[PDB]
Nanobody, 127 residues
Framework: QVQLQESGGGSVEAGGSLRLSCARSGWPYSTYSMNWFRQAPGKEREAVAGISSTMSGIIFAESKAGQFTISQDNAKNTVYLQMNNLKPEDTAIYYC?????????????????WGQGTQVTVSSAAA
């Protein structure tokens, strides 16, 4: 059985940082790509970042150079989403997703395996 186990979310102040982790276990294939998706309140689920067994990580979502960084630890079968300079509009449920195809895809329909979803809430600054 495939499991994608997420960790590392929660509440953060505007401007803060978080690193999400997704540990892949039970993977039956010699290849993969892994994505982080997110679903913000009232919005459709959208791709944030992708990485694969052959390609370095890319960020799909318009952000700013350094807002998101995706990486992986191959020995630990774990993919990471480093988030910096977080803003209220980064509040969302973040999802890990996996598929056999090692190209990079932003389409949720291409992914047959999903993590449980991790809430990230970015509070606002006083004004």
């Amino acid at each position: 059985q495939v499991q994608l186990q997420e960790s590392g979310g929660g509440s953060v102040e505007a401007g803060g940082s978080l690193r999400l982790s997704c540990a892949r276990s039970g993977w039956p294939y010699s290849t993969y790509s892994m994505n982080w998706f997110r679903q913000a309140p009232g919005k459709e689920r959208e791709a944030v970042a992708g990485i694969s067994s052959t390609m370095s990580g890319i960020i799909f979502a318009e952000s700013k150079a350094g807002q998101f960084t995706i990486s992986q630890d191959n020995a630990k079968n774990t993919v990471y989403l480093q988030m910096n300079n977080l803003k209220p509009e980064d509040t969302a449920i973040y999802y890990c997703a996996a598929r056999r195809d090692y190209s990079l895809s932003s389409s949720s329909d291409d992914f047959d395996y999903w993590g449980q979803g991790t809430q990230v809430t970015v509070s606002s600054a006083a004004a």
